[PDB]
Amino acid sequence: APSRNGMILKPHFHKDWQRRVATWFNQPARKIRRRKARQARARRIAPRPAAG
């Protein structure tokens, strides 16, 4: 129920949203995972440009 001058706001949480919560504890490990692969590729494409 609206109390006073508020914003007529509509949250999109009427579905079973808690099942499909994508958390980002992967992020710092992912940035290392991508970086390790980027290095290992650059050393493979040996005298060639790293960026492609």
Partner 1 sequence: GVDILHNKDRKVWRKEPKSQDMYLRLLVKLYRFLARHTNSTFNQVVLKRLFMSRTKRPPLSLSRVIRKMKLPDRENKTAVVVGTITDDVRVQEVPKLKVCALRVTSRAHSRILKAEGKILTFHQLALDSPKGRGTVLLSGPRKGREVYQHFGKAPGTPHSHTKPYVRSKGRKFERARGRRASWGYKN
Partner 2 sequence: PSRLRKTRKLRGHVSHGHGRIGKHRKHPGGRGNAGGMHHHRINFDKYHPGYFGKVGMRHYHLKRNQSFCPTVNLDKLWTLVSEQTRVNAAKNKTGAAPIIDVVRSGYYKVLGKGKLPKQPVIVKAKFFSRRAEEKIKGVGGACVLVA
Partner RNA sequence: UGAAACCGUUAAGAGGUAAACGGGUGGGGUCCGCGCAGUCCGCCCGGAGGAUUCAACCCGGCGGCGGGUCCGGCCGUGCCGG
Partner RNA sequence: CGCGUCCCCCGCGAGCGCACGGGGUCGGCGGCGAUGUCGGCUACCCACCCGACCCGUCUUGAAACACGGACCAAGGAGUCUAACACGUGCGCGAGUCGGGGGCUACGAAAGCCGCCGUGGCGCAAUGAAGGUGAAGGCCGGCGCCGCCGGCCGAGGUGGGAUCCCGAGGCCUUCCAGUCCGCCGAGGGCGCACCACCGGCCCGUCUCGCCCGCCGCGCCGGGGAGGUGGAGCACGAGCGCACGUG
Partner RNA sequence: GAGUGGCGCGGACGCUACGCCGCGACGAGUAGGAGGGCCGCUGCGGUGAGCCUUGAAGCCUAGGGCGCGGGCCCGGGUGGAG
Which residues contribute to the site for partner 2 (CB under 8 A)?
1-2, 4-6, 8, 10
Q: How many whole angstroms separate alpha carbon 20 and alpha carbon 16?
A: 8
Q: In which residue are the tokens 């129920």 written?
A: 1
Is 43 an interacting residue with respect to RNA (CB under 7 A)? no
Question: x-or-dash pattern for partner 1, window 10-29, by CB under 8 A?
Answer: x-------------------
Min CB(10)–partner 1 separation in Å: 8
CB of 13 to partner 2, least distance (A): 10
